[PDB]
Design a protein around this ligand. Sequence first.
Ligand SMILES: CC(C)(COP(=O)(O)OP(=O)(O)OC[C@H]1O[C@@H](n2cnc3c(N)ncnc32)[C@H](O)[C@@H]1OP(=O)(O)O)[C@@H](O)C(=O)NCCC(=O)NCCS
Ligand SMILES: CC(C)(COP(=O)(O)OP(=O)(O)OC[C@H]1O[C@@H](n2cnc3c(N)ncnc32)[C@H](O)[C@@H]1OP(=O)(O)O)[C@@H](O)C(=O)NCCC(=O)NCCS
Lengths: 286, 286, 385, 385
Amino acid sequence: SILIDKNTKVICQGFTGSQGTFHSEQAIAYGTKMVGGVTPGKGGTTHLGLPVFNTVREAVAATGATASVIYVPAPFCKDSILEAIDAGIKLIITITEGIPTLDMLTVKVKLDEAGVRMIGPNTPGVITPGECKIGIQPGHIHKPGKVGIVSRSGTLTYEAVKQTTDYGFGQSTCVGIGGDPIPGSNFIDILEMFEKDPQTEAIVMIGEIGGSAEEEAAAYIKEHVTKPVVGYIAGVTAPKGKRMGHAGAIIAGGKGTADEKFAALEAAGVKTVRSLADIGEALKTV
Amino acid sequence: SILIDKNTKVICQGFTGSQGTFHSEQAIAYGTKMVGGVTPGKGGTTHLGLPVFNTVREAVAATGATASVIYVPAPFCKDSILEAIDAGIKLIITITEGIPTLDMLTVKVKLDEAGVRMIGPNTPGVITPGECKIGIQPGHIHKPGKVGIVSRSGTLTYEAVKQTTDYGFGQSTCVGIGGDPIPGSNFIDILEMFEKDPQTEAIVMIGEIGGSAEEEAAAYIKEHVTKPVVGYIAGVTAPKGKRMGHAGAIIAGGKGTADEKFAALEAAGVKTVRSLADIGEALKTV
Amino acid sequence: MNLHEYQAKQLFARYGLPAPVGYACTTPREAEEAASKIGAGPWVVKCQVHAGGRGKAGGVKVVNSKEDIRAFAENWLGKRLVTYQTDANGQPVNQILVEAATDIAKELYLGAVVDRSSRRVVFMASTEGGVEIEKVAEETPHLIHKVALDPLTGPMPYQGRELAFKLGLEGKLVQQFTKIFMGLATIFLERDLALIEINPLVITKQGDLICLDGKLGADGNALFRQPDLREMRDQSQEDPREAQAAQWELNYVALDGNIGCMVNGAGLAMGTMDIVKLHGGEPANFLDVGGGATKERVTEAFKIILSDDKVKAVLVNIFGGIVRCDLIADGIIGAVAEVGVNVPVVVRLEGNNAELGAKKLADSGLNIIAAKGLTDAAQQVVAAV
Amino acid sequence: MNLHEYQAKQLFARYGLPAPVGYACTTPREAEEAASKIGAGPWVVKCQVHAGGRGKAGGVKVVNSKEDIRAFAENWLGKRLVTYQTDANGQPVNQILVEAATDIAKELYLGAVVDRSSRRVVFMASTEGGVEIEKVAEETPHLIHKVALDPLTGPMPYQGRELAFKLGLEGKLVQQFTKIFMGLATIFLERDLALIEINPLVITKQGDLICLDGKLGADGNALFRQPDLREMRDQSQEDPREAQAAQWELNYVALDGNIGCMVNGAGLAMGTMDIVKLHGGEPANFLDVGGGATKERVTEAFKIILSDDKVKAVLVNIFGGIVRCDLIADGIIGAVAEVGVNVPVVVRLEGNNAELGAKKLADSGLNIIAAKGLTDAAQQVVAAV
Ligand SMILES: CC(C)(COP(=O)(O)OP(=O)(O)OC[C@H]1O[C@@H](n2cnc3c(N)ncnc32)[C@H](O)[C@@H]1OP(=O)(O)O)[C@@H](O)C(=O)NCCC(=O)NCCS
Ligand SMILES: CC(C)(COP(=O)(O)OP(=O)(O)OC[C@H]1O[C@@H](n2cnc3c(N)ncnc32)[C@H](O)[C@@H]1OP(=O)(O)O)[C@@H](O)C(=O)NCCC(=O)NCCS
């Protein structure tokens, strides 16, 4: 598995809010090691049986948490992400959707410069079936296994999870890198992690129109990924120049089309599927 | 020697200006490998027998220079220093005095982040007697030798140079780190360089009131400098809170006095002298 | 969101960047009165629509009399202009920009976007103005010059100078260019822009730089902190159904097909359209159900999808979410029933109680085919057509 | 350069940061008229001088009648206030700040400077307001909290919050503090400041934060791009000779001694003062000759140094520079001759033609001892006294 496991201690920024409460509850049920949350002005109280703090730094000092999930509304994410980086957090999972591009641009530079890892924003989360769950994904469809999944989307990912669970392969860890233009981590970042992960025997890569993260991963897979990879790209029927939901799902300058990415992954010897329904099948074929 | 030698190719930013012309001329005479200068709007012409370019990038592409000396007036240094960093220059010597503190603060971060080395600003320059001269210092008083010099001042440095030349020791390389509050390189940076330099057998450290670069070097010398170091601090008779010429020569918060620095260097076992006249002597004593 | 050329120039002006003297007009009377305010002719009249290629479509002209300005205005106000960047309906022209003619010496190109690859804001300059930059790129790439804004230091003069010199400018044109570069870079960062395109950036016979045209795009995600921009949105320039869907927390985009798609998730939405296309179907739209699939939201979805007479069938594909499939099945039934859907509806539920839901659907008595598996669902909707 | 408290508060106001309601007055009449404009008393009257410790010196008082305000004003306007931070002459009081009294609940400390050690702008907060922060530091360091501004991102709310919580604030006082933090950080960066000190930053009985006092220092090197600040400089608060020297490109600072020093270079200047002190002398000043040692500039130097009656001798020490020692020797002779120096003058020339110059000096016939070596020069000036 990668990023998280049964021993990862996690705090929640936006802990006392609607989504923060609901999903933290789900995580606790799943068995995730939630040790407390942060909500400026509500420090000193307790929520979901856990301690609430005024600052990320206080929370870390008291719980030694190393990961933080963010459920803070867009307007304040640049602030809470930078606060986490400063407090010492090493892993940040930002669920929030709607963060300004120019904000992530700066945050991304700081993340790299500071050596902190962030998954997202605009992602369903990260999950190591059986060990740890951080995000909004339905736990009951996952199964401890050997396939690692990396996707730019949410519900589309569940399809691959269901299939890999049905064929019995199960999942090592599921990482949603998010649907924004400038994510904290991209395909290559996660791919390299799966390569070094002994528990991961195969990799499912799920992408969509927009940008060139996929094309760049293709070249990287050819060059540094020895394990088998099944890839799927959504957006063949999409029009150029229009945003299809995700802030990143847009074909700009006529570059970054669905077919373009399929072709790229194939030239790198990646098993690509043209029906999201056949991911499980193609996997068995390896 | 350190930083520069007989093979260092050098370009001049502010090449066609008054100081840029005069001192570039002196450098050429000394034998420095000046290969061209940069002055926006005067590209395509020739000055002092060398080519003038419109941008640092053009100059580098044509001469392969790796070092740049800056003679641009303060208001435009942040711009020309960042231009050099971008063009690929690896060594920058900024002679300019009067640069805004907040400007150097940002430039310093970029320098480190980019892995580029800058001596200054507000410095007489750098010189490896017999091999290369970059700055405004009088060449005829130097002599190829074994003593390396690091100073926060200008003319005060010449005293040490004359003495080391007179006692026959000579100099390996002379580095003026400048008199500003936030310099490109500090004592420790240069010290470490002298330690690895086989040609340098001894080190003369010249400082003054203000800040704590000296105290910090003391600790570093104790810990990582094995060669002998003679140190001199100016400003014993100076008043607290007043600027004594150099933008950095000011005792703030009552901390950073002359005696304070002497004491610090002594606690680290550094041969300190209380009369700038006895530097040569103390050196012989080692 | 996009802004009109006249709106973009007004902004460049606020930031001290040269633009022709002009006036936006809503009536033929304002248009002809603009002439005298501008000065002596000839004058340029331009229809204002978000799409480009207005010239080729005849929406841009140079006229010589107030009488002609008036004729141009009475011919376009109220009509829809159709360019190579619009659908067949084109866009409504509710504003005519009337400005002073410019003595063109040379046409340059200056733009800026957020390069997803290098993760920086990047400016492009070229001597090939007045041409679709994309072509210049693929054909003569060496004629396109770029610089990236440093997140740590912000735009710097040496960068504006670099482009100027690469474009061969010299003399006062170099400072003028740098000023424009610094200005646009500042707007980009301050107003949270996404796109900037000065095409062409003209050098006048009199020897000055002036922005003959301008295109701006703002980051929608940042409008919460861009009060002025927020107010400049022109709804008429888009499909009304789009804004209507956004209101109910749905993402919609119309297409050409007879098969409607209602899916939860953007990726899954596109994937479902693709699989329908794969089995010989023609997707009529893209509709990603953002909020929970309540009876109310699903109802709005149907109404919006079906507002297109081309739709003959509707494929619904929903995976998990925050509700149970049996509950969602009820909502879909309630929805279909209340809207009175007059076409076959193939549903594909998956997740918690997937079967219990399929059951309720199969028994609804309504025209609802409860598919088994995505491939099945796809084949059936394509069939029902 | 430094600003007056009233000038600082006016700036904080422009940036929306609370300060008492007040007025700067130049005549006793303006002072008493201020009372009614402010409201009901009592009122606070404060002498305005750059130095601190005004209170201990009796320059700060709370009065109860217009009559008293008038008396205070007539007593200080025109006089020089002497504090533990001024020389014996103190500084001229040309302005009386008259403001509304404040109901103090608690006194805090908030400041900012450029930490040379970490190379960042750093803000300090403490619950120990109304006290020389330096003392709080060395005695109870754990009561001083700091944060450094990130060059890449600029000030951030979470930082203002951090300090607020460490100070034990809560409720609306937390947002109020953060606002003030963000504001001061912004001023610091935008106006190129060097120092900021709100001491004390008061919490009122009514429960609000207000800046009872304020101290600003601007980076002189940046004034070329700070038009407003440039105009706020108050020459009267410094030694007039200093500004006078700067005009002729000389750096001067007066001391207590009988030996004047004229040296080229700040480091060498301090070093020469030190060596004189070392051999039993008492340096009367610091004078670093910036520009070339021309006859004219050297003349000004002499005039300025000798303007101090305490000076009995003058030591000149010049090393190289951009001229030859023989030429400089002539300039010194010309200078001494034209000023008509009435005290011994020991000169020490070094560099190109050092001896040829020493000769011209020894033969000038004037009262000029041409020393051989710095130590010699030092011993001789000390001697001549
Ligand atoms: C992040 C998001 C869920 C927030 O929505 P929400 O939880 O309903 O917001 P709420 O107002 O209920 O709660 C937010 C809380 O953030 C907190 N908050 C604000 N600024 C904060 C900061 N800097 N640090 C920590 N907490 C902060 C507040 O405490 C607030 O709730 P409270 O004050 O009532 O306790 C929403 O903006 C979002 O991104 N939704 C999309 C999720 C999504 O679809 N993701 C992609 C899936 S693939
Ligand atoms: C830098 C300094 C030496 C300039 O003085 P100067 O040479 O007389 O200034 P000039 O105006 O003659 O020349 C400056 C040149 O910079 C150029 N310039 C301006 N911006 C530039 C940039 N970004 N890149 C390159 N050149 C630039 C101009 O082209 C000008 O030359 P020009 O006359 O051909 O136009 C002066 O600002 C200074 O700081 N002196 C302090 C010296 C000192 O005390 N050093 C400490 C040593 S101990």
